[PDB]
Design an enzyme around this catalytic site. Structure first.
Site, PDB file in Angstrom:
ATOM      1  N   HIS A 109       0.799  -1.218   0.000  1.00 45.31           N
ATOM      2  CA  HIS A 109       0.000   0.000   0.000  1.00 45.31           C
ATOM      3  C   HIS A 109       0.838   1.277   0.000  1.00 45.31           C
ATOM      4  CE1 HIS A 109      -0.018  -0.139   4.615  1.00 45.31           C
ATOM      5  NE2 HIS A 109      -0.259  -1.398   4.367  1.00 45.31           N
ATOM      6  N   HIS A 118       6.408   6.913   5.988  1.00 45.44           N
ATOM      7  CA  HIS A 118       5.899   6.551   4.667  1.00 45.44           C
ATOM      8  C   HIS A 118       5.213   7.784   4.109  1.00 45.44           C
ATOM      9  CE1 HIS A 118       2.604   5.935   7.506  1.00 45.44           C
ATOM     10  NE2 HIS A 118       1.867   6.453   6.474  1.00 45.44           N
ATOM     11  N   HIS A 164       1.826   9.180   1.325  1.00 44.91           N
ATOM     12  CA  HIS A 164       0.643   8.932   0.498  1.00 44.91           C
ATOM     13  C   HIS A 164       0.732   9.916  -0.673  1.00 44.91           C
ATOM     14  CE1 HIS A 164      -1.265   6.775   3.921  1.00 44.91           C
ATOM     15  NE2 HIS A 164      -0.483   7.606   4.608  1.00 44.91           N
ATOM     16  N   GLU A 217      -3.626  13.428   2.400  1.00 45.02           N
ATOM     17  CA  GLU A 217      -4.725  12.878   3.194  1.00 45.02           C
ATOM     18  C   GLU A 217      -5.405  14.019   3.930  1.00 45.02           C
ATOM     19  OE1 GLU A 217      -3.185   9.215   5.280  1.00 45.02           O
ATOM     20  OE2 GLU A 217      -4.318   8.388   3.570  1.00 45.02           O
ATOM     21  N   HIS A 263       4.208  10.906   6.517  1.00 46.02           N
ATOM     22  CA  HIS A 263       3.839  10.571   7.893  1.00 46.02           C
ATOM     23  C   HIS A 263       5.036   9.910   8.589  1.00 46.02           C
ATOM     24  CE1 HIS A 263      -0.624  10.262   6.617  1.00 46.02           C
ATOM     25  NE2 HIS A 263      -0.235  11.517   6.886  1.00 46.02           N
ATOM     26  N   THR A 278      -4.872   6.120   9.345  1.00 46.21           N
ATOM     27  CA  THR A 278      -5.605   6.410   8.134  1.00 46.21           C
ATOM     28  C   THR A 278      -5.702   5.185   7.229  1.00 46.21           C
ATOM     29  OG1 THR A 278      -3.752   7.190   6.849  1.00 46.21           O
ATOM     30  CG2 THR A 278      -4.933   8.850   8.206  1.00 46.21           C
TER      31      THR A 278
HETATM   32  N1  LIG Z   1       1.095  -0.006   9.248  1.00 45.35           N
HETATM   33  C1  LIG Z   1       1.247   0.224  10.665  1.00 45.35           C
HETATM   34  C2  LIG Z   1       0.039   0.829  11.262  1.00 45.35           C
HETATM   35  C3  LIG Z   1      -0.157   2.235  10.778  1.00 45.35           C
HETATM   36  C4  LIG Z   1       0.739   3.255  11.097  1.00 45.35           C
HETATM   37  C5  LIG Z   1       0.533   4.554  10.658  1.00 45.35           C
HETATM   38  C6  LIG Z   1      -0.587   4.842   9.887  1.00 45.35           C
HETATM   39  S1  LIG Z   1      -0.891   6.503   9.344  1.00 45.35           S
HETATM   40  N2  LIG Z   1      -1.196   6.445   7.743  1.00 45.35           N
HETATM   41  O1  LIG Z   1      -2.077   6.957   9.994  1.00 45.35           O
HETATM   42  O2  LIG Z   1       0.353   7.280   9.642  1.00 45.35           O
HETATM   43  C7  LIG Z   1      -1.490   3.834   9.569  1.00 45.35           C
HETATM   44  C8  LIG Z   1      -1.262   2.545  10.012  1.00 45.35           C
HETATM   45 ZN   LIG Z   2       0.110   7.442   6.581  1.00 45.02          ZN
END
Ligand SMILES: NCCc1ccc(S(N)(=O)=O)cc1
Ligand SMILES: [Zn+2]
Ligand SMILES: NCCc1ccc(S(N)(=O)=O)cc1
Ligand SMILES: NCCc1ccc(S(N)(=O)=O)cc1
EC number: 4.2.1.1
Length: 257
Positions: free
Chosen positions: A61, A91, A93, A103, A116, A195
């Site tokens: 993803h 990571h 998006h 987002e 993020h 998210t």
């Molecule tokens: N994959 C680990 C769990 C998880 C960690 C961070 C996020 S976010 N997009 O809200 O920063 C979602 C899921």
């Molecule tokens: Zn994220």
């Protein structure tokens, strides 16, 4: 088997993850006129000098740059936070086109991407315990716009050929996440969620006001990644963003006037 397609995208997630329709879901639109300056908020403390990056993974993803979080090496404190939060991964998006991908939105403006930096509260011992707590995570969100290259992003860009498809990983040591920050640490903050599934309501969001600039070539390379595994029909990894969710009974606070 959730994802970002027409058949398994954000509008479907509630069927397996009913908290998708909860009271503190993320992301949200940040209405800059409604957000209240809170003079009791502290400056953020971002302490990344001893960060230890280890690996980069295409998880189907997004791609995650993973850190050693077994000691207080890269931590976030201050701001709206009580206590110490350790960096576990970052990571992004992003969109199929420069006019979408973030987002969070700002006055309904979508940026080309959103970074993020994910941290967990050390009082809970491990990430898996922290996500079960309302104050378990702090995620630092940073908008990306397309313009000048981001020099500190280029090591990420250049490794992406080695993790094109889901399940591939590569060594990624000695990466300095300080090279992904904007100049200012002014921010908005509100209580929210992961998210992506499982959408757990465990996040203090800290969204920086100042976007970073990356080049068209940088973000183009993100869009050549694949959702699919090796040998499977190619599905470009684009539009891996959840749209804004209802704000409900929440206040967004600003660290700045
Ligand atoms: N994959 C680990 C769990 C998880 C960690 C961070 C996020 S976010 N997009 O809200 O920063 C979602 C899921
Ligand atoms: Zn994220
Ligand atoms: N892969 C198609 C079937 C399928 C669609 C959606 C979901 S959910 N609610 O997890 O987004 C699971 C399975
Ligand atoms: N000690 C936990 C180490 C760790 C586990 C998982 C991940 S990720 N980003 O792939 O969800 C990063 C770091």
């Amino acid at each position: 088997h959730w994802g970002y397609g027409k058949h398994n995208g954000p509008e479907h997630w509630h069927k397996d993850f009913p908290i998708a329709k909860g009271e503190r879901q993320s992301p949200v639109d940040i209405d800059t006129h409604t957000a209240k300056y809170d003079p009791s908020l502290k400056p953020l403390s971002v302490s990344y000098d001893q960060a230890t990056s280890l690996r980069i993974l295409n998880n189907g993803h997004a791609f995650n740059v993973e850190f050693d979080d077994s000691q207080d090496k890269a931590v976030l404190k201050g701001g709206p936070l009580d206590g110490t939060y350790r960096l576990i991964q970052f990571h992004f998006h992003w969109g199929s086109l420069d006019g979408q991908g973030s987002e969070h939105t700002v006055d309904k403006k979508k940026y080309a991407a959103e970074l993020h930096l994910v941290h967990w509260n050390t009082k809970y011992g491990d990430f898996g315990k922290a996500v079960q707590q309302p104050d378990g995570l702090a995620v630092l969100g940073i908008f990306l716009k397309v313009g000048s290259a981001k020099p500190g992003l280029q090591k990420v860009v250049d490794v992406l050929d080695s993790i094109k498809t889901k399940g591939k990983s590569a060594d990624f040591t000695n990466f300095d996440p300080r090279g992904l920050l904007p100049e200012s640490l002014d921010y908005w903050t509100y209580p929210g969620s992961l998210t992506t599934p499982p959408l757990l309501e465990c996040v203090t969001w800290i969204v920086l006001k100042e976007p970073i600039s990356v080049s068209s070539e940088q973000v183009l390379k993100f869009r050549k990644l694949n959702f699919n595994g090796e040998g499977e029909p190619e599905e470009l990894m684009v539009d891996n963003w959840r749209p804004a969710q209802p704000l409900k009974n929440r206040q967004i606070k600003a660290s700045f006037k």
